[PDB]
Amino acid sequence: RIIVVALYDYEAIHHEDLSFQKGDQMVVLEESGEWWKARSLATRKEGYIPSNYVARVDSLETEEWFFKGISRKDAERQLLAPGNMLGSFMIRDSETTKGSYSLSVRDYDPRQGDTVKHYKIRFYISPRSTFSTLQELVDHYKKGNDGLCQKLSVPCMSSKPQKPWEKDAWEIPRESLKLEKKLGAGQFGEVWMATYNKHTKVAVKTMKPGSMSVEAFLAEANVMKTLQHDKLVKLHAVVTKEPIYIITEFMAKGSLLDFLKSDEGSKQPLPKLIDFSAQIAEGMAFIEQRNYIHRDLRAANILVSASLVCKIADFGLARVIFPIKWTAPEAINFGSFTIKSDVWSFGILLMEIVTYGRIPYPGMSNPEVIRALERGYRMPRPENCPEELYNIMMRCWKNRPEERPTFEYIQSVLDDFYTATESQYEEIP
Numbered sequence: 356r357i358i359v360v361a362l363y364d365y366e367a368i369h370h371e372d373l374s375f376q377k378g379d380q381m382v383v384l385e386e387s388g389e390w391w392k393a394r395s396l397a398t399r400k401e402g403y404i405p406s407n408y409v410a411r412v413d414s415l416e417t418e419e420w421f422f423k424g425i426s427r428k429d430a431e432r433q434l435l436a437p438g439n440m441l442g443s444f445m446i447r448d449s450e451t452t453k454g455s456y457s458l459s460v461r462d463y464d465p466r467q468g469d470t471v472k473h474y475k476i477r478f479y480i481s482p483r484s485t486f487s488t489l490q491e492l493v494d495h496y497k498k499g500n501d502g503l504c505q506k507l508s509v510p511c512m513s514s515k516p517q518k519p520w521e522k523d524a525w526e527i528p529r530e531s532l533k534l535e536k537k538l539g540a541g542q543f544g545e546v547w548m549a550t551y552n553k554h555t556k557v558a559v560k561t562m563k564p565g566s567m568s569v570e571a572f573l574a575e576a577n578v579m580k581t582l583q584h585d586k587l588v589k590l591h592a593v594v595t596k597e598p599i600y601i602i603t604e605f606m607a608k609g610s611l612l613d614f615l616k617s618d619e620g621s622k623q624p625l626p627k628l629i630d631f632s633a634q635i636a637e638g639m640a641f642i643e644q645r646n647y648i649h650r651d652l653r654a655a656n657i658l659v660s661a662s663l664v665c666k667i668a669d670f671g672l673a674r675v676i677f678p679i680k681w682t683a684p685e686a687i688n689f690g691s692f693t694i695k696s697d698v699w700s701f702g703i704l705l706m707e708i709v710t711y712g713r714i715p716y717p718g719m720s721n722p723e724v725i726r727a728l729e730r731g732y733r734m735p736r737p738e739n740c741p742e743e744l745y746n747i748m749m750r751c752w753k754n755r756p757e758e759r760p761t762f763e764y765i766q767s768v769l770d771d772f773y774t775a776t777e778s779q780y781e782e783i784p
């Protein structure tokens with residue numbers, strides 16, 4: 356008899372899903388993936404619930420201060436999100452010491468500003484203070500800082516998870532959609548803000564009938580679908596009849612390119628710009644890990660969420676279909692696209708980010724650029740760009756692909772650009 360508990364409020368919007376409130380307990384009847392069958396103890400109704408909107412009762416995930424599967428760097432982004440304060444904290448699974456936990460606390464450093472420190476847990480952080488529940492631990496450091504950089508305020512502001520997409524609805528009939536606003540148009544099709552079945556806001560990329568084979572595309576989209584990561588735009592659905600529509604999560608702030616050239620983007624200081632590029636390299640290290648290739652990495656193909664999360668779009672799309680200024684020389688001269696020619700692209704994108712969306716090689720024609728690279732010319736370091744950031748770009752732009760670093764390596768550098776390794780975690784007497 357498995358009882359679970361609602362972590363958030365949820366309105367049913369389908370045929371057989373249940374409505375419930377934060378606090379409602381439910382009897383799990385079946386665990387079918389993203390949707391589970393359950394019985395609400397509040398309504399006595401049997402139906403479907405999003406499996407990620409609940410956890411087992413008295414389990415750690417029930418706890419406001421607890422965050423499952425969150426990385427040191429993402430923990431750090433969540434505690435620096437609006438609505439937090441000094442002392443804002445959380446406890447999460449540790450990445451390095453697997454099966455163990457860590458505490459992350461919001462701080463103000465004299466030199467650095469608002470930061471987030473991290474401590475390990477073994478339960479104790481320190482010998483002079485042992486506890487038997489993490490809840491025990493938490494209240495102690497809420498009651499004055501027995502060592503820490505700050506005393507524990509209130510738990511981290513939590514996001515509400517995305518609704519899982521309707522069950523068995525990878526292929527949808529065109530009729531389920533209303534394409535309400537054209538967001539972008541181009542050579543290959545359009546992008547629209549849309550609504551699915553009157554309940555869900557989505558984006559749709561409408562593809563113009565092309566090369567093409569629908570059966571060859573649909574085979575690629577199945578692959579695209581399996582590439583699931585916080586830093587890739589999520590594919591929800593596809594309309595299989597020409598013209599093909601691709602349905603994805605909507606991204607409130609549109610493209611990174613358009614966002615950087617906006618007023619809100621102009622206010623973004625360098626460390627945030629870097630954070631962006633680190634988010635992207637994370638997404639790219641994933642793609643690299645899956646032995647996939649992007650083939651069109653640039654700011655136009657990064658999307659931005661309302662809460663400034665950067666997401667990779669159009670991955671592997673180009674295989675199925677003139678940005679030579681983002682294109683590695685071996686991709687231009689021989690059509691040899693690899694994860695390494697993506698690295699090259701990432702370099703240009705990095706320069707794009709730091710110059711708030713400015714066009715690469717400003718005032719240079721595509722041919723002018725190609726000849727320039729042949730002489731070994733590269734874009735010069737802009738004003739606001741730190742030397743070490745510029746060095747990463749130069750490494751991305753090695754003539755030899757194999758001398759270009761990995762995204763895994765790039766991610767690890769970008770991620771900790773302002774933190775010395777020894778300073779990633781804290782020491783406590």
Ligand SMILES: Nc1ncnc2c1c(-c1ccc(Oc3ccccc3)cc1)cn2C1CCCC1
Nearest residue numbers: 538539546558560604605606609610668669670
């Ligand atoms: N999902 C989106 N949300 C908001 N704006 C979007 C998108 C998307 C989007 C939607 C679907 C899509 O389709 C794929 C996603 C991943 C992999 C392959 C195709 C790609 C981009 C584009 N834009 C454009 C509009 C003009 C500038 C930015």
Ligand SMILES: [Ca+2]
Nearest residue numbers: 741742743744
């Ligand atoms: Ca420096």
Ligand SMILES: [Cl-]
Nearest residue numbers: 382394395396
């Ligand atoms: Cl019951």
